[PDB]
Every structure is written in C-alpha cells, then in structure tokens.
Amino acid sequence: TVPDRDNDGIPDSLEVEGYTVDVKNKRTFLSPWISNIHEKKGLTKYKSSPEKWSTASDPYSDFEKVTGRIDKNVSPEARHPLVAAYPIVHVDMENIILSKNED
Amino acid sequence: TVPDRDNDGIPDSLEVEGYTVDVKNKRTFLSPWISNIHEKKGLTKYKSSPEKWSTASDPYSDFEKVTGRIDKNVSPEARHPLVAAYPIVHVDMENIILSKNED
Amino acid sequence: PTTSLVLGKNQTLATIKAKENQLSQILAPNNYYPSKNLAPIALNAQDDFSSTPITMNYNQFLELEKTKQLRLDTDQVYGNIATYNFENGRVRVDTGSNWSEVLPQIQETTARIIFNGKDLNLVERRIAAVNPSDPLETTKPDMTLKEALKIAF
Amino acid sequence: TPITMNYNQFLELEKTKQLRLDTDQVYGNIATYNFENGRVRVDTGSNWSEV
Ligand SMILES: [Ca+2]
Ligand SMILES: [Ca+2]
Ligand SMILES: [Ca+2]
Ligand SMILES: [Ca+2]
C-alpha cells in the first residue's frame, strides 16, 4: 500500500517529485512525471503538498483538480493544484427606486 | 503503541519532556526535542499538558496548533500550545440615527 | 449577499441580507445574476419573509432627493460549495459547508496577484505559496513568481 | 419592528445626547480542522461561550 498522508488519492512521493494525468485509451492514469514521454505530449507537470488534501486550501482536492473530477464551472486556470479556486462576488446596484409614502 | 492519554496525537513523554515539529523533505515530523540538531534550526521547543487535548483549553489541539493543521486565521503567536487562541469581539457604534415618529 | 444601503458619506440607511426572492442558485465565474440580458432583481424588504418595505425617514428622504447619493456596500456574501461525489460522479451542494469557512483559509496561505493585461480589467488570482513560519505550509511546492505568472495568467 | 423610544426618553436624548452602546455578550461558532479532508468546518452546535 503506497503512502498517502493527506488522503487525497495522490501518493506522497508523486506529489513532491512531480506527476501528471494522462488518458491512454479512454481512462485517465495518474503517472509520476517522466521527462522522455510526457514532455512531448504537452502534459503539465504537477507538484502539490503531500500533507494537504488541497494545496491551495480551496475545497477541491488536488486529485479532483488535476483529473477533472470537479465542479465544471471551476475555470480552467484554477484546475491547477497551486491555483486557488474561489468565488469573488460583488453586488452592483443598477438603479434605486424610492417611492414617497404619502397619503 | 506509544501512550497518549489526552488523545491529541502527541505522545505523553514528548509533551512533558519537550518536542518540536520539523519538515524534512515536504513532510512534517513531530520529533522529540534534541539540543544538538534542532536548536541550530531555530525550531521552537514545545511543552504541553499530556493529559489535556488542548493545554490552553481553547478549541485547538496542541498537535493542530504546532503542526499548523488549524484555522489559518489563528494569529501566529497563538500557534504556540501554551498561548490561548480566542476571539475578543466588541461592538462600537459609529453613529446613532433617531427618526421622530410623527404624523 | 449582505448588502447595505448608505446615504451620503457613511450614514447607513439599512443593512439587508438577501431573502429567498434575491437568492441566486448558481453564480458561475464571469457571470451575472440575473444574466446580463435580463432586468436586475428587486431588493425591497428588510423582513426575513420579505413583508416589510426598506423604510427611510424624512431627513434622509430630503437629503437623498437633494444630494442623490445612495451607495450600496457589499458587506459579505453567503454561499455554498458544490463538491464532487466520488460515488456516482454528481456534484452536490452541501448547505452545511459554506464559502466563508473556506475563503479566509485561502487568503491566509496564498500570494495574491492582480493583473490587467487582459483589456485593462483587473484579474485577481491566488497562488499557493510557502509560509516559512507555518509547518504545514512549508510542505507546499516552491513557488517562483515566473511559475505563478505562467500557471495563473 | 423598529427599535422604539418613548417621549420622555426622546426629549432626554435630544437634550443630553447621551446614547451609549453596551456589548453584553457575543454569540459565535468555532471552526475546527477536519483531519480527514483538511477542510476547516464550522460547527453550529459548539460555540465560543462554551470555550
Ligand atoms: Ca496525497
Ligand atoms: Ca495534496
Ligand atoms: Ca497527548
Ligand atoms: Ca496535550
């Protein structure tokens, strides 16, 4: 049984030394990073915190992020484990209607 | 199985005799305090109550405190087990608006 | 959102948390609610059950039709996280957990980078970054600024 | 319902203009670290007055 301290599904040594996700047939593999074969495919190299279930502290595990098992609305640049995925919600008031309360 | 009466994850003898947390690769260890190797690294020596899950009685275990597995808003000086981490909330009234209820 | 209507400089007319009428089910990033083609929603009421008008008194009413200064602050925003369910793959919203639990955690452990090379609109990303004094935060991978620019923007 | 005030109180207030605001107590919840998935979660049961 491979070690996994943060319980996120990515093995610790993979998280520290680098890794990547790659479909082979129609299934995704979580391969450890390899210069000779992955770099040609344009696969991103991922590093994350072995001890944090989410490295960015946002509510999506590093595994969920890199494999895409995630809320799809999460914008693609935030799919990367080191990029925090959080809402920024501001309200703007398009116009204000007062009605005088007069008998 | 090492003894742990307060169930907080730090072994009793470690809690009494002193201990410290230290990353080695990208993982934190909860080492017993050692003069020759830890003092040079500037690591704080920690002591806590073996029988109290939190020594300061605040709702964060001594383990959670020293290892940083804690609410991040907890200010750094209160990360130390002997320093209580509690809110102090006072309300100030910036101004008071009375409206006379007159027909 | 907990909006607050402010007359003049900083005399707060009223603080209103949104009611069921003003609730927005989803708000995907780079989206408006209601969607930008539709007319904006009406905040009318102070009551939990949306049954009382947002009242304003005489001096406030006179000051408003004179100066016409009515700012709207956004004090805070309530909302829930939808999380992926490994079992049947559905994303589900936990109404227990909410973003106010998560956001301060993010702000306390990531470098913030605001950048406006995209048509001079500010874009704020947050990149996980080592915190030297926090033992758990040192376990994150080292973050050069160039790497941050590449992966975030 | 408005925070109401009666006539003698209203007169006394526009005369003396003394309206203090005491903070008798504060309700609030603790967010605690969840060892499983690392998220900090707020228990609405537990609250700071217990602690
Ligand atoms: Ca892991
Ligand atoms: Ca991780
Ligand atoms: Ca113990
Ligand atoms: Ca203890």
Whose CA is closest to C148, among C118, C128, C124? C128
Identity of the residue in D35, D46, D48 whose CB atom sits nearest the CB atom of B87: D48
Minimal CA separation from A45 to chain C, in Å: 11
d(CA B82, CA B59): 13
d(CA C18, CA A93): 13
Strands (E) in C29-122, as ranges, are: 70-76, 82-84, 91-93, 110-115
Minimal CA separation from B69 to chain A, in Å: 9
Cβ neighbour number for residue C4 with a 10 Å cutoff: 17
Whose CA is closest to B58, among B77, B43, B33, B44? B77
Largest CA distance in chain D: 61
H-only helix segments in C5-152: 58-67, 99-107, 145-152
Q: Which two tokens stand for residue D49?
A: 């007055």
**φ/ψ of residue C3, rounded to 5:** -75, 155
Residues of D with CB under 8 A from a CB of A: 36-39
Q: Tell the residue number behind the tokens 């490994």, with chain if given.
A: C86
Residue pair A60/A67 in contact (Cβ under 8 Å)? The answer is: no
Identity of the residue in C57, C108, C133 whose CB atom sits nearest the CB atom of B73: C108
Rg of chain B over Cα atoms, rounded to whole angstroms, equals: 21
Whose CA is closest to B65, among B93, B85, B45, B39? B85
Q: Which residues of D15-43 are buried (b: 16+ CB within 10 A; e: fewer)?
A: eeeeeeeeeeeeeeebbbbeeeebbbbbe
Residue B77 contacts C, CB cutoff 8 Å:
no
Pairing relationship of beta strands D31-33 and C70-76 according to DSSP bridges: unpaired
Contact (CB<8Å) C77/A87: yes
* Chains contacting chain D through 3 or more C-beta pairs under 8 A: A, B, C
Exp. method = cryo-EM
Residue B70 contacts A, CB cutoff 8 Å:
no
Classify the phi-psi angles of A53: left when phi > 0, otherwise alpha if psi is within -120 to 50, otherwise beta: alpha
**φ/ψ of residue C139, rounded to 5:** -80, -5
Residue pair A74/C30 in contact (Cβ under 8 Å)? The answer is: no
Contact (CB<8Å) D37/A8: yes
Residue pair D28/D44 in contact (Cβ under 8 Å)? The answer is: no
Whose CA is closest to B30, among B84, B67, B81? B67
